[PDB]
């Protein structure tokens with residue numbers, strides 16, 4: 133019965149790793165990764181999570197099942213992290229949150245929930261977007277469309293072209309927004325554009341679906357959430373998928389939440405129960421480890437202070453590197469003006485190199501980027517910074 | 529958009545917990561649970577897993593993403609646990625295994641994989657079966673049918689009636705077998721009946737789907753697998769979902785694997801890639817914690833020896849309790865002959881009480897069982913054993 137089965141197509145991101153872990157050139161550099169790396173080239177366990185894990189090892193007495201929605205604490209801290217302390221939404225009991233296996237698990241859960249309990253048929257995802265967004269949505273049965281976003285020429289957010297592509301979006305359609313650090317491009321709407329996008333959404337009838345995967349990496353934990361909070365203020369409904377994989381360095385523990393907000397308590401509840409049933413037919417209940425670690429940190433003044441600083445360092449390292457990158461080029465040749473790399477947020481951004489320029493980089497020079505010219509800035513160190521720009525300038 | 533949403537129906541198993549955690553009667557007893565409990569009424573963390581977790585805390589240097597299939601070690605030990613050491617299947621490179629979030633996550637993953645890459649439309653699950661089996665299958669789009677199993681009158685496995693219901697099963701149909709400790713009833717096919725069921729499956733063209741959730745609880749780790757191994761010997765294809773939640777007491781860490789076997793290397797591989805793509809659109813990659821704990825134990829002679837003993841104790845406690853149960857009744861009144869409870873395997877079995885007898889138990893006497901009359905034997909202790917049978921005999 134499996135003899136007819138077709139090879140699944142490689143992922144070139146997940147498929148890119150291999151040739152790196154096969155190349156030999158000494159200079160070898162991997163800027164196609166999706167995780168953060170410190171100045172020494174490693175993806176360390178935060179000190180704060182190591183402390184929370186010792187606590188757990190000592191205080192855990194059972195590994196019995198969590199509820200289907202996970203750890204209550206975890207759910208609350210998330211809501212507070214996302215919407216804020218004295219939020220009208222939290223006080224009105226308008227939000228229910230489900231602990232989920234990774235930001236990805238949250239997306240799929242919203243997907244299966246939306247797919248089977250509502251009349252949603254389409255989801256619009258920004259033009260360049262995290263490639264896996266589409267696949268998560270298709271597998272639920274939903275159709276994915278694309279709205280315009282990135283100005284190929286100006287390396288900016290085309291606000292008009294974006295809106296112009298969102299008028300073809302009808303009422304009960306789900307629009308997907310990246311809360312901060314746009315995954316492929318790093319270009320984020322300003323606060324005025326989020327307020328504008330919020331208003332259009334209210335009039336037009338769209339159902340917002342926020343993907344928060346890097347809270348804390350553009351400007352901070354609170355600032356990074358103003359857009360999401362601009363919508364939360366005028367919308368009666370919205371869904372939000374967050375991940376704690378990149379901001380807690382908890383990648384393989386699968387920590388993320390899927391938050392659902394309705395018009396009032398009775399509704400978020402009724403709707404939440406169907407969400408529970410979706411989870412229940414998927415993985416049954418969430419993995420306690422990484423999430424126990426996050427509830428513990430966030431609810432301990434001591435540990436939380438340390439984590440904030442660890443987040444801040446990470447964020448500051450990337451900012452140190454975007455700047456050092458746009459400079460070393462200016463010194464080592466650099467035809468073009470890469471000044472745009474600066475103030476593009478998060479670990480990524482499009483270099484703007486052609487697909488053929490990337491190949492040449494990876495083949496002669498041994499620098500590994502995603503064919504889209506997307507580079508992970510956190511994979512740059514002061515040490516490899518120089519050969520890196522020298523091999524880029526050697527291709528334009 | 530969520531105002532039309534319908535209340536999801538309660539789970540009465542997951543919905544049964546509540547009224548227990550609300551009742552007041554001192555004598556209060558919960559035999560409707562799904563987890564194991566020791567003689568003191570607790571679900572402890574094994575000593576072996578506590579040791580493996582200290583190891584991890586000390587030796588882990590990163591929490592970076594696992595592959596989509598998880599931890600290789602974990603995959604190998606599983607294969608060896610399931611098929612055996614010098615297995616033709618392992619040596620021929622005929623099996624690929626994916627670490628998954630719980631036995632439930634494995635089921636869904638097989639489900640989405642089967643749903644989208646094969647011409648499977650139906651799945652047959654034993655008559656009384658783990659209720660969540662159906663929901664996992666429906667959500668993939670597959671249809672669930674039911675084959676006969678349990679002799680209401682004899683408290684036995686109706687071998688004929690079973691087979692008689694499996695002739696309506698056509699060629700590319702998936703038949704689901706519980707490898708050991710049938711979830712609701714505890715009745716397991718003997719080795720001759722597994723060999724017979726294997727042969728029928730080969731001639732008729734069915735695709736076996738084994739659900740192993742209690743390996744080690746009926747007779748042992750190896751014996752519990754002879755059925756599965758009887759099929760593995762004649763089948764060119766078969767799928768197996770295993771869970772490590774009940775045998776490692778790792779309930780909330782979501783540890784389970786989804787094993788896929790094809791006719792040969794090239795095929796299991798091609799097919800495996802599509803399975804990877806299913807996982808990839810679901811949760812992206814598996815939680816490392818509970819699975820790291822299992823690879824570490826299983827690959828350490830010291831720790832594995834301790835675990836085996838802990839498994840053996842659990843298994844022996846349940847056997848001590850089935851026997852003590854069928855006896856205390858014989859002493860305290862007992863109309864009927866419950867001698868059938870003895871040598872019914874695992875933590876469960878049907879008491880054979882009518883749905884109205886269960887209600888009366890739970891309402892007057894404060895004993896909590898699932899309406900199907902299913903009782904968890906591991907929730908019985910020598911201490912509560914006496915009031916328990918006294919309140920049962922008070923209802924017949």
Ligand SMILES: *Cc1c(COP(=O)(O)O)cnc(C)c1O
Pocket residue numbers: 233234235236237262310315343345375376377383387388811812
């Ligand atoms: C990383 C990422 C996710 C997936 O998160 P996991 O937490 O690893 O599942 C989802 N969305 C975006 C935009 C991401 O960058």
Ligand SMILES: *Cc1c(COP(=O)(O)O)cnc(C)c1O
Pocket residue numbers: 415416629630631632633658706711739741771772773779783784
């Ligand atoms: C417990 C159980 C499962 C689910 O296992 P988890 O590992 O908790 O997902 C699946 N199948 C059967 C028969 C079970 O008893």
